[PDB]
């Protein structure tokens, strides 16, 4: 029996950094969620840790564009995980 901080083992998957917007194509979903999934179903079988995946989602999302107002979207995951979090 050991002790750990009240707030441990958490993981927030923010879709965008504060003060900014998020993008959702009414024809296929939100950039973030869609990428989240795609990456999830892809890397998970390969046994990749979640931070690793979330990092990639960070990548994929970064390359999207909203030409209209020449916009971008920056997802930002925060965490308190204490060990690798893989989803076998």
């Amino acid at each position: 029996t050991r002790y750990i901080p009240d707030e441990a083992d958490f993981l927030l998957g923010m879709a965008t950094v504060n003060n900014c917007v998020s993008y959702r194509n009414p024809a296929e979903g939100t950039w973030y969620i869609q990428s989240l999934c795609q990456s999830l179903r892809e890397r998970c079988p390969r046994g990749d840790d979640i931070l690793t995946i979330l990092t990639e989602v960070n990548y994929e999302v970064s390359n999207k564009d909203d030409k209209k107002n020449m916009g971008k979207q920056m997802p930002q995951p925060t965490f308190t995980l204490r060990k690798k979090l893989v989803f076998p």
């Binding site: 707030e7 958490f10 923010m14 950094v17 917007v21 959702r24 969620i33 060990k83 690798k84 893989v86």
Partner: protein
């Protein structure tokens, strides 16, 4: 060989998916949100989350257009639950939002912190030492992330 979070449990754990689409409620009550459109396309998000998380042996638990109030109620449930035979807990929220808060379907505000904190250790021993994931898909303000050039990658 670094430590790893355990994930073997038959149904790994619950995967709440609070998905809000119809914000007619909001539009109708809170003035300053007079023009918030319905999140046309969430369903697709919802589905994808459903599929992929099901395949990862997670028990889905969808909920549509939940007012702030409803959201709390919902979390409150999973909060008092006994996740003893659960190895993890995922909660996804798709809705409109603003600086540090998501919007109920009623235009009400829910600080993201308020939500996540519902599942601490004191607030949910059944989950102590277990991964608690939250995927929020909302807006955090009305700015546009300006992009800059580079071509490295």
């Amino acid at each position: 060989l670094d430590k790893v979070y355990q994930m073997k449990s038959k149904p790994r754990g619950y995967c709440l998916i609070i998905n809000n689409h119809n914000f007619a409620k909001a539009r109708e009550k809170v003035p300053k949100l007079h023009s918030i459109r319905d999140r046309n396309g969430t369903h697709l998000d919802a589905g994808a989350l459903t599929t992929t998380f099901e395949e990862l042996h997670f028990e889905i638990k969808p909920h549509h257009d939940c007012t702030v109030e409803q959201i709390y109620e919902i979390l409150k449930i999973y909060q008092l639950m006994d996740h003893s035979n659960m190895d993890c807990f995922i909660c996804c929220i798709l809705s409109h939002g603003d600086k540090g808060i998501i919007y109920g379907t009623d235009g009400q505000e829910a600080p993201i912190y308020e939500l996540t904190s519902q599942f601490t250790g004191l607030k949910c021993p059944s989950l102590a030492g277990k991964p608690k994931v939250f995927f929020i898909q909302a807006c955090q303000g009305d700015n546009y992330q300006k992009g800059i050039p580079v071509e490295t990658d």
